[PDB]
């Protein structure tokens, strides 16, 4: 104690003692129960386990995906929640509703519809959407606020959303569209565990393991298995291979039982994207790292360009006068190939040609005459994602010495 | 606490503990009693009196 | 026309690595008529016995003989500050080079300075029609 | 005219180490065309492999080529003793050099001395407008 | 038992970055080429000569 | 060209001996343009009279000089994990080897690190064309 | 520039064991371009034959050669003090020794001293992100 | 200056061990570039196992080639009689060493000689500013 009579050290010595750090940014959104202690309708943010019950209530659906969400990362990770207030062997391993509506028939009506997500997160650009819900309308909601975040029209805030999809053959494969937004997780009739439970933690381990590097594809025992999550043994298989086959060739993220309690698996990280415009199979946009590398590609670039504002360009005119601190179009076309070199490995593949996957323009030279303004930019940019491992089709042929 | 934030010099006992022998005096905050410039509040151009003999 | 041997922009960024300021881009002046020299091949063969060869990792180098600027420290062109240069020749040619190193500075009499600029690699323009 | 490279000023300062006595600052005249020369960047860098930069500390060194005075000993022109050298360009440069000393004296006629400076750092004063 | 644990050892390379016949890896990278992968493989039969197959 | 000598790849894959915790297959880059040096043969022999050879038992081993990666501990490189080295050269050929040990960590700046490293055996790929 | 191999800062404290006197910690400057050398695995291993390999405890070792302080006695780095040595790269990792001792000091000329500093172990700091 | 490096004063002071007649103390000058060179802690250290050491006791030594007087017989300089060496360098650092010996003699030219001194203990001025 002698060594703390001074005011040098201030010792605070305490359990909870939240820990610096701003990590990824992921929104939750679920049911609250009325023992909470949280506004409804309005994102807040959680700092640790500890007082989410007393938040969100006891037992709610948004507590338990708070729970699973907390337990699948240590560090590297802020979670924000979107409390809402419910319309006027059980369960997991670890364990009438206590939130009215159809979330309560998935143990082993009337949901809320906010549409309000212009007003309550005007702003703030999130990276990954975790509903716990499976009204279609509430989904389709999220999905088209997600679209909306991608409008040449404003300034796009990047994301994607994470949903469930729980019911047989029939019911799954029609709760199906083009919204490459959305990841819909297909569980199957029989499934043990609650479903928002699974969602919460696949969610929570996609953002939080990629987001850092946003290019590791949540596939394979090694990074896509929801370890949080157990289910009892069992030796039925949640669909036959043909229901597998046509789940994974119309876009629906198909999770297996890793065969006591066994962690579930997953076997793709795709998106809901199988259509482009009009038509067509667009691969581009099929795997759930293609839109992270998206994302984070158009951020980079956006950083990268904005030591160009306000430098004098010599359009024209003829070369820099020393002393000027001015640039011209050729010279920025050769920093902008530069940089896209420099970022082959861990943002593209090498290139095609990049003597053409790069063009610079004047506003001069792509608009007629006395339409052209000076100053304003065209830029066109056709760039590869990175190859990574898939199937490798052993043929194996056994012979006699 | 109070006497740290206005300007004064605080000393206490090396080793408080309990009964015993005699303990050294033990000092803190070797600043001077300056908390005010020409007029407004937040002077610490003078605070310390390590500053002082800087500037001597 | 076309068949002009000589450099037409010269712009030099600095950075100094202990405050991360960045001074630049600023346009340059050639001392006299020795051009910039360049070396882009990252490898440096040797020659071994008989067609063999030793391929081992090297740098891309850059020699860039530039009048001094006014503005900035001398010991921003000797080594204590990183450079960042982009030369334009007259037909076209842009070299690029990011977060190169004066690795060798030479005592200059504080106009005309020659910088052996080493980097890990130099970007090439290729003016319009390539390979 | 603004545009003109040369030197202006050129001051020593002398103390000899065994008797502590001070000397100047005397101004000093170039002997012929070429120039003093500087280096101011106290760390020698040095190429590696693929980009690298062996970063090792080093001196600031002069090279200042002068007319000899009349009234000083020659032996404090060949490291004899402590020179306090400044010298300004005619652009408003100056160059501060303190505590040098002179490190491989060549054999003079007499009249013109060439002297190797090394020291600590050597202050830049860059005439108005910086950065 | 063979083929069992053959897919035991191919799970590597589940997700890793693969570079095909375009170029070489860069530094850092954790990925990996044909080639490599052909060598790894061929050590692992190598390793397993006298428990699951003959000589060669 | 199946002309040139050298590495293209070198891969390595750290297993700590304690928390088997894997990390890798993390390529690397040389420090100079000394090559790695190998032994393939288990058997290291003797000279004794008239022609006479004695067999003994011996290790296949290695010597790997690499630049640290910064994002892995130097004592990973010193004798404290497991290594799987596999390293490219340019003509197609692929040594592959697992388990190894460092068997005598050198001192090391912190930079580059000279690998010795003893292995059961190594796996030659021999491009296309055997015999 | 990130790339860049050196040495920013040495501490050294003395901590004599007769009298229990803690000096430090001072700064330090190299006397050349020689950077400071550590082995940090604390095992040494032995070659056997056919891939086994002989585990055995030993120590941490460090080379430190650095300029002496004219304020501290010469025996204080020659092994009658214990040192406390923390160094800091210029790529931002740190070594910190603690509790070290000199086992065979060679003779110095008193200027620029050579410590191989023995320790159980050296802590690795490895600048923000690992494994 | 007060930063140089060198000797300024060697006296040697000779005491004959059969007829007890003393000689000195004489100034001598270096044959070569070579400094004097220094071992001033008295105690040996030895390198075990897990960071222990071994301390055993040892002499403090010293190597100091010197220009031998032509006053002076070349038998005193190879360990036929006592000698009381003394120091001094031009930072102001003094060595005392009294009643030491010569080791090992070496075959010297007749005009510089390298003296081995083992003495029990060397003494230190350490110029003032300490700890």
Request: glycine share 8%.
């Amino acid at each position: 104690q002698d060594a703390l009579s001074d005011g040098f050290v201030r010792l605070c010595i305490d359990p909870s003692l939240n820990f610096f750090g701003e990590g990824c940014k992921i929104l939750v959104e679920g049911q609250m129960t009325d023992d909470g202690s949280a506004t409804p309708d309005a994102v807040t943010c959680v700092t640790s386990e500890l007082d989410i019950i007393e938040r969100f209530g006891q037992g709610s659906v948004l507590t338990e995906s708070l729970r699973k969400v907390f337990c699948t990362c240590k560090s590297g990770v802020s979670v924000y929640a979107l409390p809402r207030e419910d319309a006027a062997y059980m369960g997991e391993a670890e364990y009438t509703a206590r939130n009215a509506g159809t979330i309560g028939n998935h143990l082993s009506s009337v949901n809320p519809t906010p549409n309000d997500y212009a007003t309550v997160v005007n702003e703030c650009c999130f990276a990954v959407y975790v509903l716990s819900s499976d009204d279609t309308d509430w989904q389709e909601n999220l999905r088209d606020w997600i679209r909306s975040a991608w409008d040449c029209s404003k300034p796009q805030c990047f994301g994607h959303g994470y949903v469930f999809n729980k019911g047989t053959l029939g019911q799954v494969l029609a709760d199906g569209d083009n919204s490459a937004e959305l990841s819909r997780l297909a569980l199957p009739t029989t499934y043990p565990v609650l479903p928002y439970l699974t969602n919460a933690a696949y969610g929570a381990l996609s953002a939080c393991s990629t987001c850092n590097n946003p290019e590791l594809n949540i596939q394979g025992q090694t990074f896509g298995l929801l370890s949080c999550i157990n289910m009892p043994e069992s030796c039925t298989p949640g669909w036959t291979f043909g229901e597998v086959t046509q789940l994974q060739a119309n876009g629906f993220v198909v999770s297996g039982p890793s065969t006591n309690y066994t962690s579930p698996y997953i076997y793709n990280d795709v998106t809901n994207y199988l259509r482009d415009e009009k038509n067509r199979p667009n691969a581009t946009f099929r795997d759930a790292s293609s839109r992270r590398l998206a994302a984070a590609t158009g951020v980079a670039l956006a950083e990268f360009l904005q030591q160009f504002n306000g430098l004098a360009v010599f359009t024209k005119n003829t070369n820099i006068r020393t002393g000027i601190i001015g640039t011209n179009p050729r010279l920025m076309l050769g920093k902008i190939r530069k940089w896209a070199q420099d970022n082959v490995g861990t943002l593209f593949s090498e290139f095609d040609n990049i003597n053409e996957d790069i063009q610079l323009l004047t506003d001069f030279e792509v608009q007629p005459k006395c339409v052209g303004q000076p100053g304003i930019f065209h830029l066109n940019m056709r760039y590869r994602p990175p190859v990574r491992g898939a199937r490798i089709n052993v043929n194996m042929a056994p012979a006699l010495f | 606490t109070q006497l740290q934030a206005n300007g004064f010099v605080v000393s206490g006992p090396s080793t408080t503990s309990g009964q015993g022998n005699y303990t050294s005096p033990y000092i803190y905050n070797d600043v001077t009693n300056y908390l005010r410039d020409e007029k407004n509040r937040p002077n610490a151009t003078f605070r310390d009196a390590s500053s002082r003999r800087l500037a001597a | 026309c076309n068949k002009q041997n000589g450099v037409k922009n010269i712009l030099i960024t600095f950075t100094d690595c202990d405050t991360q300021e960045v001074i630049g881009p600023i346009s340059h002046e050639q001392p006299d008529d020795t051009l910039p020299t360049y070396k882009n091949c990252a490898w440096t063969n040797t020659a071994l016995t008989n067609g063999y060869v030793q391929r081992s990792a090297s740098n891309a180098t850059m020699t860039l003989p530039v009048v001094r600027d006014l503005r900035v420290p001398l010991a921003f062109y000797q080594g204590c500050a990183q450079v960042d240069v982009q030369v334009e020749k007259f037909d076209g040619t842009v070299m690029t080079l990011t977060e190169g190193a004066v690795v060798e500075p030479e005592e200059s009499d504080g106009r005309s300075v020659t910088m052996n600029i080493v980097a890990s690699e130099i970007d090439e323009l290729l003016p319009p029609g390539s390979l």
